[PDB]
Structures are given as structure tokens and as C-alpha cells.
Amino acid sequence: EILKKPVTGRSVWQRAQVEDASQWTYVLDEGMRAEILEAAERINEQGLTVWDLDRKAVPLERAGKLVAQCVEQLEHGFGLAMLRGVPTEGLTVAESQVVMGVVGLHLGTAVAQNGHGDRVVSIPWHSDAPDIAALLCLTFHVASAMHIYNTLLQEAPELLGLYYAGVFFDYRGEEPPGEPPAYRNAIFGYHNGQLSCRYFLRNFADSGTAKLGFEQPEVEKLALDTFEEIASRPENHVSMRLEPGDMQLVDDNVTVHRRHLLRLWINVE
Amino acid sequence: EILKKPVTGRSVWQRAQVEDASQWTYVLDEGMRAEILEAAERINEQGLTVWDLDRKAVPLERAGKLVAQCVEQLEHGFGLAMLRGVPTEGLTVAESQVVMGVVGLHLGTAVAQNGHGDRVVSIPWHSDAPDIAALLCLTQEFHVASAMHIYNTLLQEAPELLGLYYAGVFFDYRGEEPPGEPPAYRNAIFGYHNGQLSCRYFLRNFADSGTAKLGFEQPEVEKLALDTFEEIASRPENHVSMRLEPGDMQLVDDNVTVHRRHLLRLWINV
Ligand SMILES: [Mg+2]
Ligand SMILES: [Mg+2]
């Protein structure tokens, strides 16, 4: 159940292997921009909600190609990918939300980000719940969690089990009745032959344990701090700047990240 | 803070190093037995309570030295010791309790074992809260293992679990939780401070009970850790077994050992 030997694959990397962003940057050309804008326009003219639609309903012959490349890079490649030239210039926030929804349909299934069920949100090392997190600039650091696992295997293997146990995170009030405020979420998991990671926002961890009325064990804080320290080493993360129209995508299974923008949460079903 | 090299010392052993019980067994002779009986008689005659007394008040000129070797064996040696010939023959349960109290005064301070504050109790691998657990047979298999050796074995076979033990698990309060707190409290299984590794492996049923009360499901890796601990302890080469005869008082040091089963039980802090 616990991986005792180094993880391998395209998602295991340091900064040197991904510094050349051309390996994972995907640029929308004028045709693709036009197709996406046209799709959003037709969704708006028919009074549809892009979140209720699927990809068959909004085909993108040429752009769907590129977004599919992105998905490939995210789920089977480095884990991160940038889609440039998202046609947001001159659009209102809501219109941009629709255009991002259009692109999102070709990423996977958009999921709720809060209690209000929002599928776009206007805006410490972490990786959120869904498979893919997307961030579009209207007007950023990434590291490999797999490499972090290998580094822990080298430097502090006695801590590995802790990550598999995970820590308590605040429910924020959405717990089903008759269960505690904070749920236990594993940081590392090994199932089916694959290692995956989630490193939720720590403070909600603190919030959650507080709500449970417990102090964090020191060894747990050591584990967390060690994780974040490994991610914070200059050789372990890549950094970038988004310009308007840039949509940065990270795969939360294998990476962790840190920072007007809009955010989308996507599960790959 | 986490020990990454094998523990060394007397308290590190397998069954082979402790199989010969003559290395840890201490025998009370007639003089010592008479001494203990006389102290008990005096305590009962004078209507005193042995649990409120102290080691000076009940001196044992010959027996105290032997009991002192028992203590040294427990805290600095193997971590187990048998005291034989405790004079319980022909005594009532209460009288036997007083005699045990007399011996206990030279072990350390007896502590409460339940909510009523009983300091003698009539009768999974575990080690109880106090420094020393004592078990005297009145009428008539006890197994002991080294927690230090178990730690070394974990270092070899499953070091990736070590941190979990340092985090410890939740154990049911049993209801004595200060009204403010959650029914269950977190207890570390291994600790390393001041150059010394120590262990407590509280009753597992209370771990499950305790997490249950909290409305949580034990993580699989946690049950793996617990099961691994106990499996290592349960290996034939890793534990020693004995049978108590009347007058035999087995003492285990809960800092460095774990153990498994009319007897009376005493809890002692040093
Ligand atoms: Mg984020
Ligand atoms: Mg016991």
C-alpha cells in the first residue's frame, strides 16, 4: 500500500526539465480564437448555460485538438500546461467566464468550488481537490509532488506513513449531519500502481483540527514543513508570469503550486 | 527527534537473552517474608492505610535491598523481574492487598487504576500508563516482549511507519475526560527525548473505541502500524513466557516492555 521505491514517469521532474516552457505551452491561433468566441456567442444567443453543456454540444474542431494536447500533458505528461491566446480581450467578466467554460468543456467536467456551487471563481504550496486546476488571466510557481515523494524517500522515509495517514481539514460547514467538522485527507496515496498526491490548504488543516479540539502533533508539523521546504528549493520548482489571455493549468494529482484572474476546477471523468 | 539507529542497552532483548529466568528472578527468604508479614500486621493493627504511607515509614532492612535490585533491573536492566516468595499463604484478599502494598512502597508510588481510585485490582500486547506494572498470584501464561527490540525491528522492516508511532493514536478516555475535552485523547506510542527512547502501547480496544467516539474511521496505514507492532511482538523468538505460582509477583517496566496475558495488580510510578 505504501510505495517504497522511487516513483517514475513524465510527472517526475525538477526545474531544469521544464524550464523550457515551449514543451508545455500551447498557443491558440486566430482560427481557434474565432471558434471559441463563436461557440460562446452561440451559447449566449440561445440563453444556454455552459456548465450544463457537454463537449459534443460545443464542438471545437481545431481548438479541441490543442486543448486535448493540454489534457495529455496534464494527465500523462509533466502535469502542467499553458494555453495562450484565450480570447478575453475586450470581454466582460461574465463573457470571459463563458469563454473559459467553453475551453473547460474540452478539459473535462467543471465542478463546484464552493457551497454556492460556483464553477468559476474570481480572484502556501498546495494542490486542490479536482484533477485539474485552471487559472486564466484577464488583467505562479509549480513543483512536482512526485519528485517531492522521491526526495522524502531519500531524506526522510520515516515520515512517509504520516503522509499516507493525512491530516484533518475543515469541512467549512458542509459535513453531512452526524459527522465531525473536519475530515481526514491523505497527502500521498498509492493505488492501482499509481502514486497520487493532494496537499490541501494547510490553514484549513489548522482550522479543522481547532474545530476538532486537538493540537497538531509536532511530527505532523515536521512532515508538512518538510514537504513545503522540499517544494521551495529553487531546483524543485518552475516559475512563470501570466499575461492576459494566458490560462495556466496544473494537474493536482502530481503537482503542487503557489501564487484579475478566473479559476476553474476540472475533473477528468 | 526521531531515532534512526538501533537502540542498545540491557532493555533490548529477544527470548534468547531472557529465557534463563535466573538472571531476573529475586527470591525472598524466610527472614524477608517474616519482615513483610510483620510490617503488614503492624499496619493492620494500627488501623493505618498502606497506600497513604511512604517507604521510610515501612522500612524493610533485608527485603528492601532485594526489592531495590528488582527496581534497578526494571529501570536499567531487562525491564522485567520476578519477585518470588511474597508471603500470601493463608491470607484474605484484603490482607494480601496490604502485603502487596508493603512490597510496593519499596518499588515507588502506587497510583489509582480506576475512577474509584483503587490501587489494587483483582483479576492484546500492551503496556500500561505507570512506570511499573506488578502482578501477584494469590491462587493459580504471562508473556513479555522488549519494546526497544520491537522498535529496532520496525527500523529494519518498516521504517516508513516510524513517524506514525511518534504521532500516536486516539484512546478512549472512558468518560474521565475533563468535561471540556473530546471523549478521547491522543497518546504517542514512541517518544525520543533526552537521549532516551520510550514506549507506551495502550490497550487497542480503547484505541478503536476512542476513535469511534470521535466519529472517525481509523486510517488503514494506522491499523497497519498497530498490527505490525503486535505481529513483531507475537513472533516466538521475540517474547518470553512464564507461569506464576502463588507468591510470585511479576514486575514489568512499561517504558521498555510490552506484555500479554486470582491475581492482584498494582501500578507504580518511580
Ligand atoms: Mg489553487
Ligand atoms: Mg496488563
Swiss-Prot record, chain B:
EC number: 1.14.11.-
Cofactor: Fe(2+)
Alphabetical keyword list: Antibiotic biosynthesis, Iron, Metal-binding, Monooxygenase, Oxidoreductase
GO process annotations (BP): antibiotic biosynthetic process
InterPro entries reported for this sequence: AlphaKG_dependent_hydroxylases, TauD-like_sf, TauD/TfdA-like
Catalytic activity: 3-(N-acetyl-N-hydroxy)aminopropylphosphonate + 2-oxoglutarate + O2 = (R)-(3-(acetylhydroxyamino)-2-hydroxypropyl)phosphonate + succinate + CO2
Involved pathway(s): Antibiotic biosynthesis
An annotated Gene Ontology molecular function: metal ion binding
SUPFAM superfamilies to which the protein is assigned, alphabetical: Clavaminate synthase-like
Residues that hold Fe(2+) according to the record: 126, 128, 259
Secretion signal, residue range per the UniProt entry: none
Cofactor, how bound (note): Binds 1 Fe(2+) ion per subunit.
Role noted for this protein: Monooxygenase involved in the biosynthesis of the phosphonate antibiotic FR-33289, an antimalarial agent. Catalyzes the oxidative decarboxylation of the antibiotic FR-900098 (3-(N-acetyl-N-hydroxy)aminopropylphosphonate) to form FR-33289 ((R)-(3-(acetylhydroxyamino)-2-hydroxypropyl)phosphonate).
Quaternary state and interactors: Homodimer.
Entry similarity comment: Belongs to the TfdA dioxygenase family.
Domain notes: Has a jellyroll core motif at the center and helical bundle motifs at the periphery and an unusual lid structure which consists of two beta-strands with a long loop between them. An access tunnel is found at the back of the active site which connects the putative binding site of 2-oxoglutarate to the solvent outside.
Protein name in UniProt: FR-33289 synthase
Protein's organism: Streptomyces rubellomurinus (strain ATCC 31215)
